[PDB]
Design a protein around this motif. Structure first.
Motif, PDB file in Angstrom:
ATOM      1  N   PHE B  11       0.824  -1.204   0.000  1.00 58.09           N
ATOM      2  CA  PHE B  11       0.000   0.000   0.000  1.00 58.09           C
ATOM      3  C   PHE B  11       0.860   1.257   0.000  1.00 58.09           C
ATOM      4  O   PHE B  11       0.622   2.178  -0.788  1.00 58.09           O
ATOM      5  CB  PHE B  11      -0.943  -0.006   1.201  1.00 58.09           C
ATOM      6  N   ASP B  12       1.875   1.305   0.866  1.00 59.49           N
ATOM      7  CA  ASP B  12       2.754   2.469   0.910  1.00 59.49           C
ATOM      8  C   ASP B  12       3.535   2.624  -0.388  1.00 59.49           C
ATOM      9  O   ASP B  12       3.714   3.742  -0.884  1.00 59.49           O
ATOM     10  CB  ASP B  12       3.708   2.364   2.100  1.00 59.49           C
ATOM     11  N   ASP B  13       4.010   1.510  -0.952  1.00 60.69           N
ATOM     12  CA  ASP B  13       4.765   1.573  -2.199  1.00 60.69           C
ATOM     13  C   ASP B  13       3.917   2.150  -3.324  1.00 60.69           C
ATOM     14  O   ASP B  13       4.348   3.061  -4.040  1.00 60.69           O
ATOM     15  CB  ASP B  13       5.277   0.182  -2.573  1.00 60.69           C
ATOM     16  N   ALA B  14       2.696   1.637  -3.486  1.00 64.15           N
ATOM     17  CA  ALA B  14       1.824   2.132  -4.546  1.00 64.15           C
ATOM     18  C   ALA B  14       1.394   3.571  -4.284  1.00 64.15           C
ATOM     19  O   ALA B  14       1.253   4.364  -5.223  1.00 64.15           O
ATOM     20  CB  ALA B  14       0.609   1.220  -4.692  1.00 64.15           C
ATOM     21  N   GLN B  15       1.184   3.926  -3.013  1.00 64.20           N
ATOM     22  CA  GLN B  15       0.820   5.296  -2.672  1.00 64.20           C
ATOM     23  C   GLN B  15       1.930   6.265  -3.052  1.00 64.20           C
ATOM     24  O   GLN B  15       1.674   7.332  -3.621  1.00 64.20           O
ATOM     25  CB  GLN B  15       0.499   5.386  -1.181  1.00 64.20           C
ATOM     26  N   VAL B  16       3.177   5.900  -2.755  1.00 65.56           N
ATOM     27  CA  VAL B  16       4.308   6.732  -3.152  1.00 65.56           C
ATOM     28  C   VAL B  16       4.424   6.779  -4.670  1.00 65.56           C
ATOM     29  O   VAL B  16       4.712   7.831  -5.253  1.00 65.56           O
ATOM     30  CB  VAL B  16       5.601   6.217  -2.494  1.00 65.56           C
ATOM     31  N   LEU B  17       4.191   5.644  -5.334  1.00 63.05           N
ATOM     32  CA  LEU B  17       4.364   5.582  -6.782  1.00 63.05           C
ATOM     33  C   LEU B  17       3.349   6.462  -7.502  1.00 63.05           C
ATOM     34  O   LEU B  17       3.677   7.098  -8.511  1.00 63.05           O
ATOM     35  CB  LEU B  17       4.261   4.131  -7.256  1.00 63.05           C
ATOM     36  N   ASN B  18       2.108   6.510  -7.010  1.00 61.50           N
ATOM     37  CA  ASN B  18       1.104   7.305  -7.710  1.00 61.50           C
ATOM     38  C   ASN B  18       1.304   8.805  -7.532  1.00 61.50           C
ATOM     39  O   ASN B  18       0.632   9.582  -8.219  1.00 61.50           O
ATOM     40  CB  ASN B  18      -0.312   6.910  -7.276  1.00 61.50           C
ATOM     41  N   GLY B  19       2.193   9.233  -6.639  1.00 60.96           N
ATOM     42  CA  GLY B  19       2.493  10.646  -6.518  1.00 60.96           C
ATOM     43  C   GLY B  19       2.689  11.154  -5.103  1.00 60.96           C
ATOM     44  O   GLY B  19       3.053  12.318  -4.909  1.00 60.96           O
ATOM     45  N   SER B  20       2.457  10.304  -4.109  1.00 63.62           N
ATOM     46  CA  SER B  20       2.613  10.711  -2.722  1.00 63.62           C
ATOM     47  C   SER B  20       4.063  10.556  -2.272  1.00 63.62           C
ATOM     48  O   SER B  20       4.907   9.995  -2.974  1.00 63.62           O
ATOM     49  CB  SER B  20       1.682   9.905  -1.816  1.00 63.62           C
ATOM     50  N   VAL B  21       4.346  11.068  -1.078  1.00 72.00           N
ATOM     51  CA  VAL B  21       5.685  11.039  -0.517  1.00 72.00           C
ATOM     52  C   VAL B  21       5.812   9.844   0.419  1.00 72.00           C
ATOM     53  O   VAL B  21       4.822   9.263   0.874  1.00 72.00           O
ATOM     54  CB  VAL B  21       6.028  12.355   0.217  1.00 72.00           C
ATOM     55  N   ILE B  22       7.058   9.470   0.710  1.00 69.52           N
ATOM     56  CA  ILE B  22       7.322   8.360   1.616  1.00 69.52           C
ATOM     57  C   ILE B  22       6.998   8.783   3.041  1.00 69.52           C
ATOM     58  O   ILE B  22       7.451   9.834   3.514  1.00 69.52           O
ATOM     59  CB  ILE B  22       8.783   7.901   1.488  1.00 69.52           C
ATOM     60  N   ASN B  23       6.213   7.963   3.734  1.00 68.95           N
ATOM     61  CA  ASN B  23       5.802   8.265   5.104  1.00 68.95           C
ATOM     62  C   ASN B  23       6.943   7.914   6.048  1.00 68.95           C
ATOM     63  O   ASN B  23       7.227   6.740   6.295  1.00 68.95           O
ATOM     64  CB  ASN B  23       4.536   7.498   5.469  1.00 68.95           C
ATOM     65  N   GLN B  24       7.606   8.941   6.584  1.00 66.09           N
ATOM     66  CA  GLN B  24       8.646   8.702   7.577  1.00 66.09           C
ATOM     67  C   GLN B  24       8.053   8.326   8.928  1.00 66.09           C
ATOM     68  O   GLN B  24       8.608   7.473   9.629  1.00 66.09           O
ATOM     69  CB  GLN B  24       9.536   9.934   7.720  1.00 66.09           C
ATOM     70  N   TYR B  25       6.939   8.944   9.307  1.00 65.75           N
ATOM     71  CA  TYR B  25       6.287   8.690  10.590  1.00 65.75           C
ATOM     72  C   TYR B  25       5.105   7.750  10.355  1.00 65.75           C
ATOM     73  O   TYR B  25       3.986   8.184  10.070  1.00 65.75           O
ATOM     74  CB  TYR B  25       5.894  10.009  11.270  1.00 65.75           C
ATOM     75  N   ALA B  26       5.369   6.450  10.456  1.00 66.69           N
ATOM     76  CA  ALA B  26       4.332   5.433  10.349  1.00 66.69           C
ATOM     77  C   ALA B  26       3.603   5.290  11.678  1.00 66.69           C
ATOM     78  O   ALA B  26       3.714   6.160  12.548  1.00 66.69           O
ATOM     79  CB  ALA B  26       4.929   4.092   9.917  1.00 66.69           C
TER      80      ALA B  26
END
Lengths: 49, 49
Positions: B11-26
């Protein structure tokens, strides 16, 4: 490429005159932070396990 | 969801791929995405990115 490391890193590894207070040409031993940076550069291209 | 269905991505990988940033604070009970990508493991020093 075989070591998976940068060519200048290979050059630095070769340039190490490990003479340690004479008996040969000269002591080309890098400084402490230079050693640390060289280790980082030569290790940066490994796997996860 | 579309990338997870075809490319089989997290989910995080696809979210970043579609245009979002990497979540540092999970959720912080486990490894975050930023730490999973660049802290597995830290080489010698603490990460500063």
């Amino acid at each position: 490429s075989a070591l998976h490391t940068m060519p200048s890193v290979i050059r630095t590894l070769v340039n190490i005159r490990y003479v340690t207070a004479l008996n040969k040409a000269e002591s080309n031993l890098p400084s402490w932070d230079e050693w640390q940076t060289l280790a980082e550069n030569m290790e940066a291209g490994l796997s996860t396990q | 969801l579309f990338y997870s269905h075809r490319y089989a991505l997290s989910f995080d990988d696809a979210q970043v791929l579609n245009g979002s940033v990497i979540n540092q604070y999970a959720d912080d009970d486990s490894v975050s995405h930023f730490n999973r990508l660049f802290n597995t493991p830290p080489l010698k020093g603490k990460i500063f990115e």
